[PDB]
């Protein structure tokens, strides 16, 4: 008897989140939940019930402590000695969209559906986004 | 070096995707109307380029 959402039934809103002055992880955890559709009572584990999220002002995201200097983003190229590193400061300055995407991707489910859920995220450096056509509502983070 | 595991029916079939003959490079003979290989003498009538060979 428990209802199950499906591709026919699901209806996705577009939400704008302003990242300006928000803590990276605290914003990310709320956005990850919205992308998964945890805020909807029709939440169904095996389908994507979540909403689209636009993040603007990704360059203005905040980090506490000495994380700007000391938080390191590692990656390995799969070649010997191929560990590359960037600081959070370097990420925020040069790759702010990747920084938010990395935070949120790590908080999403792993697997096919989790990868599909991430496609509804759209992160932007500045104030503007190109999704006027999707008629996005402002979403304040609960916190 | 020997097979560590036997190959499944599936994997054998996947390998044989490309193990396939092509259709001959054939055209209609303008003399007799039988199919011939392009750029070859027609075996049926012995013609090539409108000339009996």
């Amino acid at each position: 008897t428990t209802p199950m959402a499906n591709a026919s039934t699901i209806e996705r809103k577009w939400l704008v989140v302003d990242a300006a002055g928000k803590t990276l992880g605290r914003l990310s955890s709320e956005v990850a939940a919205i992308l998964r559709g945890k805020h909807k009572p029709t939440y169904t584990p095996h389908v994507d019930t979540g909403d689209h999220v636009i993040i603007i002002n990704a360059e203005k995201i905040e980090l506490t402590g000495k994380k700007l200097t000391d938080k390191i983003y590692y990656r390995h190229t799969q070649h010997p000695g191929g560990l590359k590193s960037r600081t959070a400061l370097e990420m925020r300055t040069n790759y702010p969209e990747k920084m938010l995407e990395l935070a949120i991707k790590g908080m999403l489910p792993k697997g096919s559906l989790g990868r599909q859920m991430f496609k509804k995220l759209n992160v932007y450096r500045g104030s503007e986004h190109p999704h006027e056509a999707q008629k996005p509502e402002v979403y304040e983070l609960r916190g | 070096a020997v097979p560590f595991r036997r190959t499944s029916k599936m994997k054998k079939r996947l390998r044989r995707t490309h193990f396939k003959l092509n259709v001959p490079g054939m055209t209609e003979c303008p003399s007799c109307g039988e199919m011939k290989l392009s750029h070859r003498v027609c075996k049926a009538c012995g013609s090539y380029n409108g000339k009996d060979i």
Binding site: T1, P3, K38, P41, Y43, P45 | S8
Partner: protein, 118 residues
């Protein structure tokens, strides 16, 4: 008198193979591997009949939490408030209302809020 192996062996093995219909490759074809997979399927089915009850409760709670938060309550406080009000409607039913009749759910959420605000 001699008893030949006869038909009993074929009959027994064939039943296992019919239980393995739909399994991949040799697992629906060969007795030994089909047998193992049917046995494994038994262990899994037993385990999962138990896990099914966990997974649905988990699903209902998630949906109640979503509906509660639309009414300005967390799941934790809603269930506390329902318990104080003496409402004994279970999570399956609460999650059913959350999806199907959200106005009815909101009344129960309002009843919970009344007890909490005492």
């Amino acid at each position: 008198p001699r008893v030949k192996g006869g038909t009993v062996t074929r009959k027994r093995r064939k039943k296992v193979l019919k239980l393995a219909k739909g399994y991949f490759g040799s697992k629906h074809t060969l007795y030994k591997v089909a047998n193992q997979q049917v046995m494994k399927s038994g262990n899994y089915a037993f385990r999962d009949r138990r896990q099914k009850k966990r997974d649905f409760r988990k699903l209902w709670i998630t949906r109640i939490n979503a509906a509660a938060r639309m009414n300005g309550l967390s799941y934790s406080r809603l269930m506390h408030g329902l318990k104080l009000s003496g409402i004994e409607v279970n999570r399956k039913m609460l999650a059913d209302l959350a999806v199907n009749d959200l106005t009815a759910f909101n009344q129960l959420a309002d009843a919970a809020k009344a007890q909490l605000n005492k």
